[PDB]
Design an enzyme around this catalytic site. Structure first.
Site, mmCIF file in Angstrom:
data_model
loop_
_atom_site.group_PDB
_atom_site.id
_atom_site.type_symbol
_atom_site.label_atom_id
_atom_site.label_comp_id
_atom_site.label_asym_id
_atom_site.label_seq_id
_atom_site.Cartn_x
_atom_site.Cartn_y
_atom_site.Cartn_z
ATOM 1 C CG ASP A 85 -2.172 0.886 1.030
ATOM 2 O OD1 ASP A 85 -2.299 1.495 -0.051
ATOM 3 O OD2 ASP A 85 -3.003 0.986 1.972
ATOM 4 C CE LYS A 86 -0.573 7.183 -2.145
ATOM 5 N NZ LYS A 86 -1.381 8.362 -1.729
ATOM 6 C CG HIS A 87 -0.154 6.399 5.224
ATOM 7 N ND1 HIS A 87 -1.409 6.906 4.961
ATOM 8 C CD2 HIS A 87 0.095 6.670 6.526
ATOM 9 C CE1 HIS A 87 -1.891 7.473 6.055
ATOM 10 N NE2 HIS A 87 -1.002 7.335 7.020
ATOM 11 C CB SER A 88 -0.022 10.419 1.301
ATOM 12 O OG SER A 88 0.225 11.771 0.992
ATOM 13 C CB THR A 125 -8.881 8.705 -1.028
ATOM 14 O OG1 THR A 125 -7.587 9.280 -1.260
ATOM 15 C CG2 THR A 125 -9.159 7.636 -2.079
ATOM 16 N NE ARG A 173 0.208 12.311 20.438
ATOM 17 C CZ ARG A 173 0.278 11.999 19.141
ATOM 18 N NH1 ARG A 173 -0.347 10.924 18.688
ATOM 19 N NH2 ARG A 173 0.974 12.750 18.296
ATOM 20 C CB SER A 188 -0.784 8.967 15.209
ATOM 21 O OG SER A 188 -1.007 9.079 16.601
ATOM 22 C CE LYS A 192 -7.654 4.908 12.353
ATOM 23 N NZ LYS A 192 -8.825 5.683 11.828
ATOM 24 C CE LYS A 193 -2.899 3.691 4.289
ATOM 25 N NZ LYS A 193 -3.930 3.083 3.411
#
Ligand SMILES: Nc1ccn([C@@H]2O[C@H](CO)[C@@H](O)[C@H]2O)c(=O)n1
Lengths: 442, 440
Positions: A85-88, A125, A173, A188, A192-193
């Protein structure tokens, strides 16, 4: 009882010692189960802010947050490729995910893209895909697993049972001035990813005025931290620094970005900066996923599935699998909602575009109805910008700043003022910068 | 005539309908001048293309204005008109305590409710376990009860958002129930016809929830909040747990007994307390009876603990023709089942999961609910002393006590309870009672 063990763990971290994996998982689960009080959470967070965490601690924290809810296991499906996958950190006009998933899927990867909504000017998205009539972002995971097995990619939003400890942890926080800590931020960003059960991951860390981190140096430091933790968590990970000093795609919104993604996949139009970033991110996924040996092999495979239509077809099959129309790629203008008023906006002066405020452009789309001021709001999926001018472009009376798609003339005029104010012209042309900067490996 | 198909075609093509068009169509549904086919087509176009917030508001207000809309201003009450609505559950008895609690804190609560549907209990059926209780006071007695007691729980008229009747009836045979804008307008139209100053929505999460998944429950709650506030009623929503029975009982009489004992303080299920208290807090805040959470709960704890809430409930029961001394002597009035026996699990683990849908259907099968509208109800049957998610279960701790008509229905109910409750060697992850609060 748990409160006694919690206070010992706080005292241990308070005094500069490293916490054990077992202590970190105990405390994260107590946050999840509400058996550890808000005071104790804040105290631990503040001891981490002060003393930091070692790499084993950072890894334990992220894996504990990851293991606090559902973790997807793909072994029983017997896929014959990598889960990747990709995360950003996000951006205005960043539609990369909608092409990247299909392009990687077409090259033999399996891409379980679980993502989210708007969040404060950048466009989520999931909202973009819901511009497609019928498209369903919440398949049950038997359907989800089937789509991954059959199509190779799905873009969904079932996020509730993913890393739920992050929810209470971040909430504390954010009222105790313990957000701004690299080990907590990394946790954080990743938990999740990582709950997607990935073999590999690429992280897109933005650089520029429109970025989550405010300086090049701080983007690079965040990316190295993410790379170190993710690999320590057993997921083959790299990061790219990529540019967010302007809109990435040529469009910003929802329907308009879906349209840009289809045209990119088919070859009808490929914004060169969006192409550079998309291709670079997909390359990392093939290499880390062990689908290509090097950059040149990965780019050849990726360009091939763009050229023969396979990537566009995977997107079409994904849209149909998630209950959109089966002929979406061929007939997207039939299905995507059109705004009532589409009209170019021109600058008051002539010159070159030297700078652009992407947060302000993002907020202009939101104000038009293209995003949510409050979570209870409904999105108008047709509004937004297309034909974005870019840094360095010549701007005169015949060359607009953008085409604004609006629901009526009052909101059109309001968006035009916002667009003109967000874009800075200058007599001399600026210098160019890369779209993709450093590639960061472990 | 002709406009109906043009309205369908407009939405089929993905265009937004105007307020005029929506009000036309809704009135045509109510007047029976738009056919079932045209209703279903429009519903399917909405299922595919959804609705903007202006369309959702128009739709909800059109359905609200299709019948009687109550107006309370002329009585000049010294407090807000507030109410609660729930997507329903098993053991979801909160209204019986929440109404009196809020009325005892200064609110006026015209609770026009409903009966059980499918697997979930209905507040009105539970109240009819009380001998003499009349859920159909005329407008006159209804106004006077609100004025003098502050709360009444009644069934609704033919002219309460009647447009929803044909609309829902068509949706339920054409696979167009499952549409958030349609669901939102259906849920709200009847409640907003009460003429409320404020409203709180209880949207259930879990195996007994209306929506199947958390994110779908969340989406619905957000939509309801947006539309209700857009309709001019201060509204918030809670996401609350329905992965098990909420009260310790499920049924009618057994749930009335539990509500009385909660108000007096004899016994308070702590999960039921959390949900009830949380819902009442929203009503006090939205109704401008309390500035914040702490002040609201202080006011609410006070009326639970000085007997005021229990007394308001007894006044309400007596005003609606139940007994004068129902709170003090409920065991004299509520009916008793013929057979009351504990049911025991076969394994010895922890309670990991509970199929509340199946528990609710078990109660219906005993006679505690309906499958057709014409069915009659045995108000004495149901479950008490429900075991809970996370409890340790061995041969000395029952899953529940089953109240049944005879040994045969007892056996059938015991098979359903044993099947609906899953035991495991490992203690499950803790589930909260209130997942989140949703405001505008
Ligand atoms: N704030 C929100 C969020 C979601 N939704 C509705 O939820 C469904 C799937 O996201 C879609 O029907 C979508 O419209 C909504 O109405 N309001």
């Amino acid at each position: 009882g748990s409160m006694f063990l919690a206070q010992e763990i706080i005292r241990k971290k308070r005094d500069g010692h490293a916490l054990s994996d077992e202590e970190i998982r105990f405390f994260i689960n107590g946050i999840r189960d509400n058996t550890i009080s808000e005071g104790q959470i804040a105290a631990l967070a503040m001891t981490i802010f002060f003393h930091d965490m070692t790499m084993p601690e950072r890894v334990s924290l992220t894996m504990a947050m990851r293991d606090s809810g559902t973790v997807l296991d793909w072994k029983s499906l017997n896929l014959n490729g990598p889960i990747v996958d990709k995360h950003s950190t996000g951006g205005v006009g960043d539609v990369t995910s909608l092409m990247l998933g299909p392009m990687v899927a077409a090259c033999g990867g399996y891409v379980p893209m679980i993502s989210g909504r708007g969040l404060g000017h950048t466009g989520g998205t999931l909202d973009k895909l819901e511009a497609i009539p019928g498209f369903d972002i919440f398949p049950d995971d038997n359907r989800f697993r089937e789509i991954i097995q059959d199509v190779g990619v799905a873009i969904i939003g079932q996020t509730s049972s993913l890393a739920p400890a992050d929810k209470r942890f971040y909430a504390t926080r954010d009222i105790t001035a313990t957000v701004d800590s690299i080990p907590l931020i990394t946790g954080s960003i990743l938990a999740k990813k990582l709950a997607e059960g990935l073999d590999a991951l690429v992280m897109d860390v933005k650089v520029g005025s429109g970025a989550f981190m405010p300086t090049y140096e701080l983007s690079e430091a965040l990316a190295e931290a993410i790379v170190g933790v993710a690999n320590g968590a057993g997921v083959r990970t790299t990061a790219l620094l990529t540019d967010m000093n302007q809109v990435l795609a040529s469009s910003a919104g929802n329907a308009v970005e879906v349209r840009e993604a289809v045209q990119f996949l088919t070859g009808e139009y490929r914004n060169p900066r969006l192409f550079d970033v998309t291709m670079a991110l997909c390359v990392e996924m093939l290499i880390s996923g062990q689908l290509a040996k090097d950059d040149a092999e990965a780019r050849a495979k990726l360009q091939a599935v763009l050229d023969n239509g396979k990537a566009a077809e995977v997107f079409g099959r994904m849209v149909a699998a998630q209950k959109g129309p089966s002929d979406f790629v061929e007939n997207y203008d039939k299905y995507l909602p059109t705004a009532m008023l589409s009209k170019a906006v021109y600058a008051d002066t002539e010159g070159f575009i030297s700078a652009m405020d992407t947060r302000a452009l993002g907020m202009a789309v939101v104000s038009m109805g293209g995003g949510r001021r409050q979570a209870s709001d409904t999105i108008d999926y047709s509004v937004g910008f297309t034909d974005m001018a870019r840094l360095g472009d010549s701007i005169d009376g015949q060359r607009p700043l953008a085409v604004i798609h609006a629901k009526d003339e009052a909101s059109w005029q309001e968006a035009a003022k916002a667009v003109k104010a967000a874009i800075i012209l200058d007599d001399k042309a600026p210098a160019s910068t890369p779209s993709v900067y450093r590639r960061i490996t472990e």
